[PDB]
Amino acid sequence: ALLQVTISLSKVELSVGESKFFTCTAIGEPESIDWYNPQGEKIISTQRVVVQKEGVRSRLTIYNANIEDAGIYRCQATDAKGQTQEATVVLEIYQKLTFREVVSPQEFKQGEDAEVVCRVSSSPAPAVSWLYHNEEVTTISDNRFAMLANNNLQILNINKSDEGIYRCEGRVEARGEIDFRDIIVIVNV
Numbered sequence: 001a002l003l004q005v006t007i008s009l010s011k012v013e014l015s016v017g018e019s020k021f022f023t024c025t026a027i028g029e030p031e032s033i034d035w036y037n038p039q040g041e042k043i044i045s046t047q048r049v050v051v052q053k054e055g056v057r058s059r060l061t062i063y064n065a066n067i068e069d070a071g072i073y074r075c076q077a078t079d080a081k082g083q084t085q086e087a088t089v090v091l092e093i094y095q096k097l098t099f100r101e102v103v104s105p106q107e108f109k110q111g112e113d114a115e116v117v118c119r120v121s122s123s124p125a126p127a128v129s130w131l132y133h134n135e136e137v138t139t140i141s142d143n144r145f146a147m148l149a150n151n152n153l154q155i156l157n158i159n160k161s162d163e164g165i166y167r168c169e170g171r172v173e174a175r176g177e178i179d180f181r182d183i184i185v186i187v188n189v
């Protein structure tokens with residue numbers, strides 16, 4: 001009685017917090033259509049993770065996704081005799097760029113070794129760059145300046161000429177994702 005079970009998408013990527021749906025189509029005469037999550041459990045509809053069968057189709061909607069929603073889902077149709085067919089879909093879930101507690105301005109006294117703080121996160125880990133504003137926002141090349149392993153900007157023996165606007169830029173190259181925060185750096189003489 002079951003000709004074919006398929007899901008509209010085979011693979012989908014989404015960020016934590018994003019919502020997505022999938023449609024299972026069971027051509028023929030299914031008696032039941034159920035979904036199983038990556039933990040292997042039969043999905044019982046809730047407010048956040050919803051299943052609805054309508055004719056020979058079943059829709060799974062995942063609202064406000066979290067990392068534990070990631071993995072392979074199965075749609076299993078069953079006919080009246082108890083024979084089953086199934087299809088699968090893969091959900092890949094990542095974390096988009098997120099800046100935390102941005103502080104601006106940040107003040108330093110001339111001569112001290114400054115650390116300009118920037119806190120950005122993502123999965124995979126973000127690639128961070130610091131840039132300096134003039135007419136064009138440009139990448140910094142100066143021997144007193146270095147990005148630290150915690151993504152902050154070290155400025156050795158900070159001078160009044162170092163005062164200005166600094167851009168903390170976060171990138172995830174594999175997605176082409178980019179975001180930034182401009183930080184006013186003040187040097188008290």
Ligand SMILES: *[C@@H]1O[C@H](CO)[C@@H](O)[C@H](O)[C@H]1NC(C)=O
Pocket residue numbers: 159160161
């Ligand atoms: C720091 O400020 C001084 C004072 O004007 C100036 O000579 C210069 O722009 C800065 N020194 C450098 C370039 O490191």
